[PDB]
Structure formats: structure tokens, C-alpha cells
Amino acid sequence: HHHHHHMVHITLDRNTANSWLIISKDRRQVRMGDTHQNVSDNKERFSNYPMVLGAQRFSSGKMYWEVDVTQKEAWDLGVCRDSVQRKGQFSLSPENGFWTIWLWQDSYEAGTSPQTTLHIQVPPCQIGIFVDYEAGVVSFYNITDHGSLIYTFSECVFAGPLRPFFNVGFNYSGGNAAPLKLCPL
Ligand SMILES: CCCc1cc(=O)oc2cc(OC(C)=O)ccc12
Numbered sequence: 501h502h503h504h505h506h507m508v509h510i511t512l513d514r515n516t517a518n519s520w521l522i523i524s525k526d527r528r529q530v531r532m533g534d535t536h537q538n539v540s541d542n543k544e545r546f547s548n549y550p551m552v553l554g555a556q557r558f559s560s561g562k563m564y565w566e567v568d569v570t571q572k573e574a575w576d577l578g579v580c581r582d583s584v585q586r587k588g589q590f591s592l593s594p595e596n597g598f599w600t601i602w603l604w605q606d607s608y609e610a611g612t613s614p615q616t617t618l619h620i621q622v623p624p625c626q627i628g629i630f631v632d633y634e635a636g637v638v639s640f641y642n643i644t645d646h647g648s649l650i651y652t653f654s655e656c657v658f659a660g661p662l663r664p665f666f667n668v669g670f671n672y673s674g675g676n677a678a679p680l681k682l683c684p685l
């Protein structure tokens with residue numbers, strides 16, 4: 501791909517984070533803590549899953565960023581509506597306002613309803629996310645494999661401002677403690 505020139509500097513929004521998450525001082529890295537991180541509750545926080553939003557809101561244009569997923573067993577990445585449900589149980593689907601991919605139990609899937617199997621030959625250590633607001637497109641790229649396409653959502657009905665979306669996943673196994681990291685431009 502040649503989307504690198506739409507690079508945007510994303511930072512994480514602490515106020516949206518699940519109360520177990522630990523966000524770095526530079527707001528570029530997030531990981532699962534082993535306990536509640538001693539923050540007050542608020543209506544923005546994702547309550548049921550280890551999720552957080554980027555601070556940036558996008559309503560037009562073309563945007564690109566990259567995320568490091570090295571040594572994780574489970575995660576989900578993409579964008580979502582600013583208006584997504586924060587409390588209780590929900591599925592990651594375009595009907596619920598999410599355009600995402602995930603790793604779970606040794607398989608990669610796109611967050612459609614029902615979910616779609618992804619075909620990845622080189623397990624990625626870094627993911628590129630491209631959003632074209634006007635075109636209604638969200639695309640995912642395998643940076644480890646020379647930028648190869650992973651998945652494109654087209655005919656997207658955003659229906660609102662978009663925010664970068666992150667899920668570091670649970671760490672029931674003891675093998676998923678590693679952070680998600682926003683990679684430098
Ligand atoms: C068996 C799957 C459990 C699960 C694991 C995980 O890391 O993230 C999730 C995110 C979910 O997103 C929503 C709230 O729609 C739903 C379920 C999960």
C-alpha cells in the first residue's frame with residue numbers, strides 16, 4: 501500500500517479505558533493490569549472488556565496509523581463510532597458501530613456479524629489501519645509481510661464521528677500480558 505502519507509499521531513483517552521488498563525505516560529501504549537488501577541468510574545469507561553479509545557475524532561478525510569501486537573495471544577483493533585455502547589455485553593460488529601479485526605485462539609477474524617475468517621500466512625507483529633471517511637472504507641495491512649492486505653470493510657455506514665478502537669484482551673492464560681503500542685511515524 502501507499503497510505504503511509506495519511507499518518508496521524510494517535511494518543512489514548514484515559515477516561516474511556518476499562519479500570520484495569522495501564523496507559524503509558526506518553527499515552528501511546530496500553531496493557532492489562534493484574535487488578536483494578538484505582539480510578540473512579542464514569543459513563544465513558546468500557547466496563548466488561550479491556551477496551552480503550554483514541555482521543556482523536558475523525559469525521560472526514562483519510563487517516564492511517566500502526567499498532568504493535570508483538571507476542572499477544574488475543575486483541576482487537578480498528579475504529580468505532582463515538583456513540584458505541586460502553587456498559588454490559590455486546591459483539592464487535594458494524595451493526596453495533598465497530599469496524600475491527602481480532603486475534604483469538606490462534607485464528608484471525610474480521611468483526612462482521614457473523615465473523616469472517618482471515619487468511620494470514622505471516623502472523624503480524626504490526627498492523628496498519630487505514631480509514632477513508634468519504635469512501636466508507638476501513639482497511640487493515642500486515643506490516644510484517646511488506647504491507648499485504650488483511651481485510652477491507654467497504655460500504656461502511658459510519659453514522660457518526662469515528663474513534664480509534666483498542667482491546668488488549670484478557671490474560672486468563674498468563675500468555676497475553678504484553679501491551680498494544682502505537683508505532684512511530
Ligand atoms: C469468547 C470471546 C470473549 C471476548 C474476548 C475479548 O478479548 O474481547 C471480547 C470483546 C467483545 O466485544 C464486545 C463487547 O462486543 C466480546 C467478547 C470478547
Ligand SMILES: CCCc1cc(=O)oc2cc(OC(C)=O)ccc12
Nearest residue numbers: 574575576590591592602603604669
Ligand atoms: C478478542 C476479541 C474476540 C471476539 C470479539 C467479539 O465480539 O466476539 C467474539 C466471538 C467469538 O465467538 C466465540 C467462539 O465465542 C470469539 C471471539 C470474539
